[PDB]
Each structure stands twice: as structure tokens, then as C-alpha cells.
Design a protein around this nucleic acid. Structure first.
Ligand SMILES: [Zn+2]
Ligand SMILES: [Zn+2]
Ligand SMILES: [Zn+2]
Ligand SMILES: [Zn+2]
Ligand SMILES: [Zn+2]
Lengths: 76, 74
DNA sequence: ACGCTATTATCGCTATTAGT
DNA sequence: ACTAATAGCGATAATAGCGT
């Protein structure tokens, strides 16, 4: 089944299965438990979000390859 | 039987005091001279957010190094 | 330093919204 | 309808961190 809804609570509160006061930047829930730096809200749908991560992973992966290449050239 | 993982830093637990929980290192064990030995345990409901935080920080540093190397190569 | 129980977070389970 | 996603309550397992 398709997921068109964009959750209003933060990702962590969702995972922890507890009510999110949904304050921004970070919710009190996360600030309280000390994970405010991990608190964030979804802006796109599950699917758009999945794609985005795939792109970022590939970008990340290729950059590591490139850097290795350059470092290897700076001492060949 | 649940899987409750402690939230404060390893030391404060060990000592049994209240952890201000500040990140990356709490004031509790910054006052006692061990700041950079202060770390927290990984919560399962934080793996993903955590993994995503490394990825971002790393994509960030790699872009700074690629430029730094591209120059040092001339 | 730590024993010890008041404080506090987990996740089975109830409701409810919404894809087909 | 049927029931996959969501929201998240709350009994209570367990950590939290106070006070000896
Ligand atoms: Zn939240
Ligand atoms: Zn949050
Ligand atoms: Zn601490
Ligand atoms: Zn440090
Ligand atoms: Zn600490």
C-alpha cells in the first residue's frame, strides 16, 4: 500500500512510539531524553525520501572513491 | 522483558550521578576532568538517525578534502 | 561509593485513518 | 469491506541518582 501521508511527529518519537509535542527545531521529547541533535521531521513522502537516500548514498560512495584516487596520486 | 538502554553517559552511570546529558560530552564529567571519555550508549530507535548523521558529516568532510587535494595537486 | 525504590521509558495492544 | 499504516496509551520492567 502507498504512503501518501507525511507524519507530523518527529522520526524518533515515531520509532519510540510516544506522543510528540512536535515543537521545532526539535521537540521537547527528544530534548528531554538528550537526543535533540537527532530530532527531525519528514518533509516528503516515504517514497521520495527513499529515493533521496539512495541518491545520497551513491553520491557519498563515489566521493570516497574519488578521494582515495586523489590521495593515492599525492604520493604515488 | 524489555530492552531498556541507559540514556546518560557511561561514567555518570558508573558513578550513579545525574547526567546533564549534554553532547558530545556532559558537564558532569567535564567538571571531573574526563570530558573526552564521555560517550552514550546506542539506542536502537536512534540507529537510523545516527547512521544518517554520520553520512552527512562524512559527505561534508569529503567535499572539503576533495577540494583541498585538488589544490595540493597544483 | 552505592544500596534501593521513586522516577521513567518500552512495546504489546487498542483506535483510527485511509489504500484498493 | 478488508486490513496495511499510523498514533501513541500505559502497566510495569528497569534504570535513575538521592541520600546514608
Ligand atoms: Zn518528537
Ligand atoms: Zn524529536
Ligand atoms: Zn554524564
Ligand atoms: Zn571529545
Ligand atoms: Zn559524561
Amino acid at each position: 500500500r502507498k504512503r501518501n501521508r507525511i507524519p507530523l511527529g518527529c522520526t524518533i518519537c515515531r520509532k519510540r512510539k510516544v506522543k510528540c509535542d512536535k515543537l521545532r527545531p526539535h521537540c521537547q521529547q527528544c530534548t528531554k531524553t538528550g537526543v535533540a541533535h537527532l530530532c527531525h521531521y519528514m518533509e516528503q513522502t516515504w517514497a521520495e525520501e527513499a529515493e533521496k537516500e539512495l541518491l545520497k548514498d551513491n553520491e557519498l560512495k563515489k566521493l570516497r572513491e574519488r578521494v582515495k584516487s586523489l590521495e593515492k596520486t599525492l604520493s604515488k
